[PDB]
Amino acid sequence: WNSNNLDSKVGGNYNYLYRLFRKSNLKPFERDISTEIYQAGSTPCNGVE
């Protein structure tokens, strides 16, 4: 159902997030909270940025 009245706020509601990039797919009903930095291409980023 629509939940605009509480969740949304002006200027950007950044409380809830999502994984834009993952190394693999997801098994059903599996919760991932690793939130670890992901590297693409030549995966050279062993650091932070």
Partner: antibody
């Protein structure tokens, strides 16, 4: 983040007119939009609104069939008007949102006279 | 579908609390009422939305009450710069009583 309207000019009654508000810094495909009018000596009233999926259906009851709203491209939305009357004189603001709005453009007045 | 702004005109002082009543003919859709302050010659600015939730970047003086058919706005004080007409933007369960509506103006004057 800004909006700017265009197309306000003196036009005889019964002639079609094209209005247009353009979005700067963002595209009219994520943020809700609305079309509103404010007469110089009368309250504010809304006419049309469309964003994302086809949403043009929502129109004012008094507006009837002479009011249509369509976005020509991603950043510009045009307004088409028919059957102009002396009671249609008002200031046209490009609202941003159906029930809640953040910021509008300066507003282009469209006066109707013969 | 037309929302009545009772009273149409409201007068208050700088340190005097401000109240206003906006009544809706029909029940609103899931608390979708909004409020905008329309300074003359310029489109209105947001002050309170969803009855009571405060937008980001506005003064901490506007608080809203009521739900369903009756709603009200309460302002703790005025810094003489809030002289504008307030429009209670009534979201409706759309396709019934139009799809949304705007009420009448309610400007606040300050006597000095």
């Amino acid at each position: 983040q800004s909006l700017e309207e265009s197309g306000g000019d003196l036009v005889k009654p019964g002639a079609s007119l094209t209005l247009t508000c353009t979005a700067s810094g963002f595209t009219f495909s994520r943020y809700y939009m609305s079309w509103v009018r404010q007469a110089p000596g009368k309250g504010l009233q809304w006419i049309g609104c469309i964003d994302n999926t086809i949403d043009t259906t929502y129109y004012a009851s008094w507006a009837k069939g002479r009011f249509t709203i369509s976005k020509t491209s991603s950043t510009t939305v045009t307004l088409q008007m028919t059957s102009l009357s002396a009671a249609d004189t008002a200031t046209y603001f490009c609202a941003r949102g159906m029930v809640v709005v953040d910021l509008w453009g300066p507003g282009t007045l469209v006066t109707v006279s013969s | 579908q037309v929302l009545t702004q009772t009273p149409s005109s409201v007068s208050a002082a700088v340190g005097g609390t401000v109240t206003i009543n906006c009544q809706s003919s029909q029940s609103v859709n899931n608390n979708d009422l909004a409020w905008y302050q329309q300074k003359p010659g310029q489109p209105p600015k947001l002050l309170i939305y969803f009855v009571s939730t405060l937008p980001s970047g506005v003064s901490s003086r506007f608080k809203g009450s009521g739900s369903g058919t009756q709603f009200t706005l309460t302002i703790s004080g005025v810094q003489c710069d809030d002289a504008a007409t307030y429009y209670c933007q009534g979201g409706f369960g759309c396709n019934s009583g139009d799809c949304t509506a705007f009420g009448g103006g309610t400007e606040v004057v300050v006597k000095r």
